[PDB]
Design a protein around this ligand. Sequence first.
Ligand SMILES: O=C(O)[C@@H]1CCc2c([nH]c3ccc(Cl)cc23)C1
Ligand SMILES: O=C(O)[C@@H]1CCc2c([nH]c3ccc(Cl)cc23)C1
Ligand SMILES: [Ca+2]
Ligand SMILES: [Ca+2]
Ligand SMILES: [Ca+2]
Ligand SMILES: [Ca+2]
Ligand SMILES: [Cl-]
Lengths: 360, 358
Amino acid sequence: MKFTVEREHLLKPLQQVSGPPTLPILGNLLLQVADGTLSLTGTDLEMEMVARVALVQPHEPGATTVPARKFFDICRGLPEGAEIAVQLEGERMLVRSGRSRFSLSTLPAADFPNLDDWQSEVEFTLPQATMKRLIEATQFSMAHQDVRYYLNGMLFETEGEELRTVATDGHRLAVCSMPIGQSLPSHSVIVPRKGVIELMRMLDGGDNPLRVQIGSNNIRAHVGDFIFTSKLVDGRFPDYRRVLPKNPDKHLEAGCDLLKQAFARAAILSNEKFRGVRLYVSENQLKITANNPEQEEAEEILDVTYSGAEMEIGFNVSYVLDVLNALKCENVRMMLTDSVSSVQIEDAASQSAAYVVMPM
Amino acid sequence: MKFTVEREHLLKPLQQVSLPILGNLLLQVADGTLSLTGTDLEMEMVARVALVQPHEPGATTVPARKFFDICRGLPEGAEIAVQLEGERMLVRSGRSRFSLSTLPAADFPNLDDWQSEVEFTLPQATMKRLIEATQFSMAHQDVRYYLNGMLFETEGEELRTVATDGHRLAVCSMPIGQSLPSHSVIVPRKGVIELMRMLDGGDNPLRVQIGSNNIRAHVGDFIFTSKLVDGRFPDYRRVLPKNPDKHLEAGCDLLKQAFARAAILSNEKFRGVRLYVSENQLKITANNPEQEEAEEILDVTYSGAEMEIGFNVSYVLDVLNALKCENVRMMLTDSVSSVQIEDAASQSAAYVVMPMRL
Ligand SMILES: O=C(O)[C@@H]1CCc2c([nH]c3ccc(Cl)cc23)C1
Ligand SMILES: O=C(O)[C@@H]1CCc2c([nH]c3ccc(Cl)cc23)C1
Ligand SMILES: [Ca+2]
Ligand SMILES: [Ca+2]
Ligand SMILES: [Ca+2]
Ligand SMILES: [Ca+2]
Ligand SMILES: [Cl-]
């Protein structure tokens, strides 16, 4: 196995396959030269990233595996415009560039683990920006290491011509739907949180569309010369329609950033553990208050657009702040029911995403 | 106690000054001025804010982080009105209102009174240069408490800083245009850190006052006071190589990148790399317990006898990152002697690294 490639053609592929073990070979990248292509594979047994690099210079076929981080750190450490000559010699991989020479240990390619083979049941294409939008709008609401394993991940749902993401930790929910202009079956799967992070990581910028394949136990995303494959999560994800308030007809509208800074200041004097704040809504006005065990108190009063009846309601302020930070918009709509029911929150200008927060 | 001040006039003082009372700030309105004091019993920062708006005298202490966070959270340009109300401190700005707990100003601890024995003034930029050049070589929580800080030494018209962790050494000296007594003190590392951040590098001169057990630095509206480390510092002069007659000179960044690349395949604990020096050429090699190997060859300026020497690559990279210059000189003797490292174009800072037998 031999190849010579430009540093700049190696960097991003290495970065993509490198991110991230007790089982050593999982710390290695599989390198394959075949049919004028270098393939770079990294895996953790649950998910897999494969990058393909075209070889325009002389090369020889073969396969090996090398320490991922070390190989990446060596390539990144080399100067702008460096040319990187690699060859398998003995049980070592030789890396040469200029007068820099490196000899890395290898583990046999035959030892590199493969995911189980599977069949694609559902397929579609969508813009990179759309997938980015879907993930960023909901990602923050996924659970972290909850015993309900199905919540430590993100639902991806196809319905009509819409792709939808749902994330919830049992206390708050985020949902976002986008048109992708294809007739899709009605289907949903849960992608593990690590898979979601990796999927987000591969976009990227630029105008490369994303190709998605969904199997009974796997998801695959093709973008450019990268292929990401993940296992799915078992379990019955909650139905976002049961979480959305059935009729939240008390509509409050306020500047997103003004609203956020008011909640953030009030948050300073909220209970450090429970983070509770009270909202007092009345005609065109919102009052936010907070207090802690040591009798410290915050009060914020804002002008808002509100014509409904007056009500009081308590919330975990971090949850509200999460939502407002996730809304990169000018105005927010808060949709209320009563003092003991959840609130729906949306961008005043768009219904594409919805956020639900339970009262305290 | 009562005052009304613009948010932005509080932010820098608050940043600078930031038992539970040690988590509070002492606030004092007196003679047209707001004073804010923070302390951890070892050191203290006092900031002064001129009060152009109507005010009423008094003193209290409030939670530092909360009060800072409230002020920083309010909108740019906001006016912040503060008054005492029983056991509480009221903070108002627009339609935002905050009631904070207080602890008595009488309970706020003071550093012991002391006499200034040695004094000098120097540009802030000079003090910043002195500390930056050496700071990274201070020990962290070493049993030898006298190394967990930085030596400040006066001699003739020069101020010198020394820092060592018992393994490598940094030294920096600058003339300051004033005749000084021959003296030296050890400033605790947290004190060094605080002093550093008190300096904007600007046009306000820095006044330093040193007592038998304390040091004080005054810059414009800020006064920093710290206890000294009461111990003996090692003599730096004994560690400098007697007569290093083998000077290698090379571009700092190229030298650094070569070492940083070779370091990847060096021992993770002991970080030894080898140098082979020959006429106008340097070869760096590294290997680890897995027998992975790195080699770097680069052009340098060198005309001395051919030699080989090993160093901790982490220590050398620290030096090269601190130097931030165009060209570096490595002053070599032999394989069993330490190396002195300097900016090729300045003797003001010098760094010593021990030899390694690899
Ligand atoms: O499977 C579960 O335990 C559900 C997870 C999602 C969820 C449950 N109760 C909720 C109440 C409010 C919100 Cl926002 C989400 C949930 C229960
Ligand atoms: O008091 C001590 O223990 C000394 C601290 C300074 C020091 C010791 N051995 C060293 C070796 C190299 C350098 Cl640069 C400093 C020291 C021992
Ligand atoms: Ca209703
Ligand atoms: Ca509260
Ligand atoms: Ca002296
Ligand atoms: Ca070595
Ligand atoms: Cl080699």
